């Protein structure tokens, strides 16, 4: 299984731009 790590480091390339965005 690897599919759900892709979503806790996939979720974090919104995150990122959570960053800055607020």
Do not use: P
Not at 5 to 21: A, N, P, T, V
Request: avoid cysteine.
């Amino acid at each position: 299984v690897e599919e759900k790590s892709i979503d806790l480091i996939q979720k974090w390339e919104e995150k990122s731009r959570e960053f800055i965005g607020s």
